[PDB]
Amino acid sequence: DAEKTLNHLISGFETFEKKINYRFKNKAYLLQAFTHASYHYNTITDCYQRLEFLGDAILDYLITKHLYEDPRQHSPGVLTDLRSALVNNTIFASLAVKYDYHKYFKAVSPELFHVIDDFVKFQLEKNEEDIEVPKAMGDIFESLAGAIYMDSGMSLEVVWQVYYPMMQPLIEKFSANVPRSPVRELLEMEPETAKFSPAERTYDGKVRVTVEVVGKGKFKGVGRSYRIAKSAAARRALRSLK
Amino acid sequence: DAEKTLNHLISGFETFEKKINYRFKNKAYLLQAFTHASYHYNTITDCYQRLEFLGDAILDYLITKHLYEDPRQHSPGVLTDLRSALVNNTIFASLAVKYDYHKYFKAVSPELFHVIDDFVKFQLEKNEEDIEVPKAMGDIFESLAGAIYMDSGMSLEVVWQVYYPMMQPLIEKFSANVPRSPVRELLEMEPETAKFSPAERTYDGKVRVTVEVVGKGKFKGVGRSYRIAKSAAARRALRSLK
Numbered sequence: 001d002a003e004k005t006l007n008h009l010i011s012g013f014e015t016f017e018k019k020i021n022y023r024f025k026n027k028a029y030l031l032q033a034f035t036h037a038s039y040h041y042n043t044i045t046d047c048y049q050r051l052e053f054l055g056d057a058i059l060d061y062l063i064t065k066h067l068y069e070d071p072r073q074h075s076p077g078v079l080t081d082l083r084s085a086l087v088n089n090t091i092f093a094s095l096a097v098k099y100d101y102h103k104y105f106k107a108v109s110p111e112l113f114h115v116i117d118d119f120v121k122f123q124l125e126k127n128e129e130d131i132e133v134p135k136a137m138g139d140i141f142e143s144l145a146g147a148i149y150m151d152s153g154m155s156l157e158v159v160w161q162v163y164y165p166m167m168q169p170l171i172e173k174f175s176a177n178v179p180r181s182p183v184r185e186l187l188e189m190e191p192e193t194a195k196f197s198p199a200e201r202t203y204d205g206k207v208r209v210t211v212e213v214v215g216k217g218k219f220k221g222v223g224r225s226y227r228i229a230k231s232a233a234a235r236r237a238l239r240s241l242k
Numbered sequence: 243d244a245e246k247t248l249n250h251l252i253s254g255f256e257t258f259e260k261k262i263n264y265r266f267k268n269k270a271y272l273l274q275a276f277t278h279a280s281y282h283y284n285t286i287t288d289c290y291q292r293l294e295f296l297g298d299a300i301l302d303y304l305i306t307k308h309l310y311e312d313p314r315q316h317s318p319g320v321l322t323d324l325r326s327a328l329v330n331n332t333i334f335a336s337l338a339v340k341y342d343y344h345k346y347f348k349a350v351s352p353e354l355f356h357v358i359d360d361f362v363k364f365q366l367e368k369n370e371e372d373i374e375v376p377k378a379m380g381d382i383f384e385s386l387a388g389a390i391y392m393d394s395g396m397s398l399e400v401v402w403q404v405y406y407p408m409m410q411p412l413i414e415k416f417s418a419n420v421p422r423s424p425v426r427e428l429l430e431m432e433p434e435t436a437k438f439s440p441a442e443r444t445y446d447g448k449v450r451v452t453v454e455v456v457g458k459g460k461f462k463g464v465g466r467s468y469r470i471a472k473s474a475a476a477r478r479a480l481r482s483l484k
Contacts, residue, residue, distance in 0.1 A: 037469065038467070053325070064296065207282050226282055
């Protein structure tokens with residue numbers, strides 16, 4: 001008999017919905033999100049794997065919409081590093097356990113749990129390297145996103161309401177700690193008080209540019225593109241004025 | 243002088259906006275989307291690279307929302323193949339030229355254009371293998387998506403209004419031509435007239451399942467997960483009834 005097999009299965013999820021602050025209308029989405037493959041007891045939904053897939057795309061689109069909107073207005077080279085370091089099944093996974101995803105994880109695997117656990121313990125100790133990683137726990141951070149979306153009528157903002165909070169901090173500590181895109185570093189630096197020459201091309205076919213400043217004189221950049229010539233000019237500048 | 247440098251730069255884009263059926267309020271988004279790095283003439287926007295990045299995520303989220311909603315309700319193994327074959331900078335690129343993206347591409351590179359061209363010609367001939375690929379032309383199929391979105395106040399549906407049309411056909415020809423997920427192959431096949439045993443586990447620890455049918459008798463599947471045991475049961479079934 002179904003309708004009750006289920007309550008059986010979601011007993012406890014009460015806290016989890018509390019912890020993450022969201023409340024599932026179809027609880028079956030919750031459960032599935034969390035049903036691994038080895039959990040041969042659940043016969044009423046698919047494992048979460050199909051919601052893992054979906055969820056990726058979402059977190060992607062999102063962490064990306066994010067990084068790209070950052071007023072730090074990153075260079076595109078650092079954007080793909082940042083994208084790459086932030087979407088990352090190992091990060092996803094370290095969030096899940098920061099968030100207890102592993103307390104409601106449904107599977108059959110002692111094997112897997114000593115892992116999952118040796119893994120959980122590492123994370124927290126660290127929090128006042130060589131430690132292997134429970135793939136699945138990035139995998140469910142994904143799935144849930146899928147789950148929640150599918151719950152809210154496919155709402156991106158909703159999923160974001162929930163998940164921002166969780167990465168917001170990580171995302172932020174990554175970015176402060178990068179290459180200050182040097183034009184922006186210093187359009188910011190000296191606002192309307194630094195000026196950029198038209199672009200002018202060169203004998204070995206590169207673009208060159210030149211920056212003047214407030215009685216701090218003028219610096220001269222070169223590179224194979226404008227964007228680059230520009231920052232190279234900025235970079236030599238940025239240097240002086242320290 | 244700026245305001246006119248620009249009209250200079252977008253002369254022609256009239257057709258392109260026509261061809262794809264969309265009309266840019268800020269034309270500068272259009273232009274940028276299309277400004278390569280080697281195009282040292284444009285000094286009023288960034289090259290499109292930052293909009294390439296953004297655009298990826300979008301097409302991703304989208305082609306994905308797509309594949310996952312497909313009533314064929316694919317297995318998750320085929321979903322990542324399909325995702326992988328459809329998002330693919332080489333496909334993106336073959337759409338761009340199917341769509342003339344290359345007529346409005348701004349760059350400096352004869353070098354690149356013999357490529358771009360030897361490339362364009364190949365595609366069309368084919369249309370009533372060893373041919374190398376202009377990365378940039380997937381790259382701008384992406385960017386535009388970025389562009390358009392950024393134009394429409396960040397509207398996903400809008401970008402989709404435009405881009406669906408372009409992949410809709412490709413997407414569709416890929417899917418018809420895959421592994422028919424065998425449960426679905428035949429919940430479809432024989433609707434309410436095929437039944438699935440509870441799951442029952444085994445001596446070497448796998449899940450097993452059994453399917454009965456309309457006086458077409460009963461077939462028996464095994465695999466390390468339920469989902470799998472199921473289709474394996476389905477598969478042996480599917481076989482008989484041909």
